């Protein structure tokens, strides 16, 4: 419901905000799948 501010001065805590994990390049996903597969 609450609307986040367009402009931010400093990083403040926000209950209910999920952290954003970093996404690796496609190569990472493919490599894992292959290794498990035989």
């Amino acid at each position: 419901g609450p609307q986040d501010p367009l402009l931010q001065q400093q990083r403040a805590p926000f209950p209910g905000q999920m952290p954003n994990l970093p996404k690796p390049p496609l190569f990472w996903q493919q490599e894992a799948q292959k290794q498990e597969a035989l």
Binding site: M18, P19, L21, P22, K23, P24, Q29, A32, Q33, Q35, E36, A37
Partner: protein
């Protein structure tokens, strides 16, 4: 003027932690490491995105002098639920800073998020040792 925090922790604190542990897992006798806050995340390949799970809790590694030798538990603070899983020696790990990544059966991807990256490093080291020591 400036003062540094004490590196050594009181023994009383450790005892209290192990007490809470016994409440869910009667067979947990010793604590190896504990992270103040840890959350479980899963990756869905179909969507190419990460999805947060309903498990958000304090992470503890438990040691026992009987089978299973080692097991990991998360105390879900928000949902007041217990989640436990045994440690297997076939798991392969990978470190993408600051988030820890590991592979699971059937080519699934799951990871753990820690309040502090360094804190995560210590925990991961323990697991690595278990894999190579038995």
């Amino acid at each position: 003027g400036p003062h540094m925090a004490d590196l050594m922790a009181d023994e009383s604190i450790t005892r209290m932690n192990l007490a809470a542990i016994k409440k869910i897992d009667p067979y947990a006798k010793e604590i190896v490491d504990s992270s103040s806050h840890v959350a479980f995340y899963t990756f869905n390949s179909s969507q190419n995105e990460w999805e947060k799970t309903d498990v958000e809790g304090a992470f503890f590694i438990y040691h026992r002098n009987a089978e299973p030798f080692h097991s990991i538990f998360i105390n879900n603070r928000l949902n007041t639920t217990s989640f436990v899983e045994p440690i297997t020696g076939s798991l392969e790990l990978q470190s993408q800073p600051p988030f820890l990544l590991y592979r699971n059966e059937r080519s699934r991807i799951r990871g753990f998020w820690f309040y502090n990256s360094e804190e995560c490093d210590r925990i991961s080291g323990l697991v690595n040792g278990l894999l190579k020591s038995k």
